[PDB]
Design a protein around this ligand. Structure first.
Ligand SMILES: CC(C)c1cc(C(=O)N2Cc3ccccc3C2)c(O)c(CO)c1O
Length: 219
């Protein structure tokens, strides 16, 4: 019948960080400018998943136990019309917390910087992947992006950013993906075409027709 009052927790559960300025500049650039072919975002995500799937499979031959979390190497695409989300799940190698904060918030600095310099000298947005930072093209279509990831050597973590100059990371006790990465795009009001059946088939067939892993569409 008492009333305790927990004045201190084990660890801070929600950490907030600022992107390196160059990453923020590119993100502000992406989320605001016009691009005629915004469908390429899905190509960049599928491209990242192929790489994550490749990396766990390379390690799969030297150590067969690294598929403890799942033996199927696949990509799943789930539009959710009533939540305005599109999610891509892969069972690739995933990311540790250290990698997640570092890769998305910090060491992307060089690629984003070189890419912006490239843009002013006449490159276009579709070259973003040749600068290793294709992930940020998600903001062509999303007002908010969430990344859930699970690496064999770490726990599951959730990353989030609405492109306001900062991102958050927290331990995700939500649904366990056993290994890999889940990207959740909260789409802008005008990009709801990517919640429809035909259009998503159209984009995968147009851009990722030669991926060496199965892509499954869930409606
Ligand atoms: C958020 C964005 C950067 C991203 C990361 C991963 C991901 O964990 N990896 C892991 C890994 C290991 C070696 C090369 C490439 C990669 C990608 C991923 O699988 C996807 C799939 O969409 C993503 O979008």
């Amino acid at each position: 019948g008492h009333m305790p009052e927990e004045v201190h927790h084990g660890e801070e559960e929600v950490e907030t960080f600022a992107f390196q300025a160059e990453i923020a500049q590119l993100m502000s650039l992406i989320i605001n400018t016009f691009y005629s072919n915004k469908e390429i975002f899905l190509r960049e995500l599928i491209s990242n998943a192929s790489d994550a799937l490749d990396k766990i499979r390379y390690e799969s031959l030297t150590d067969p136990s690294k598929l403890d979390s799942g033996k199927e190497l696949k990509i799943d695409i789930i539009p959710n019309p009533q939540e305005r989300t599109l999610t891509l799940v892969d069972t690739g190698i995933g990311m540790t917390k250290a990698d997640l904060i570092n890769n998305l918030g910090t060491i992307a600095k060089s690629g984003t910087k070189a890419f912006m310099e490239a843009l002013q000298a006449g490159a276009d947005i579709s070259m973003i992947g040749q600068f290793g930072v294709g992930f940020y093209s998600a903001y062509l279509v999303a007002e908010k992006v969430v990344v859930i990831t699970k690496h064999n050597d770490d726990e599951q973590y959730a990353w989030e950013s609405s492109a306001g100059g900062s991102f958050t990371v927290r331990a995700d006790h939500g649904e366990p993906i056993g290994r890999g990465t889940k990207v959740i795009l909260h789409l802008k009001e005008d990009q709801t075409e990517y919640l429809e059946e035909r259009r998503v088939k159209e984009v995968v067939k147009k851009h990722s027709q030669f991926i060496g892993y199965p892509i499954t569409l869930y409606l």
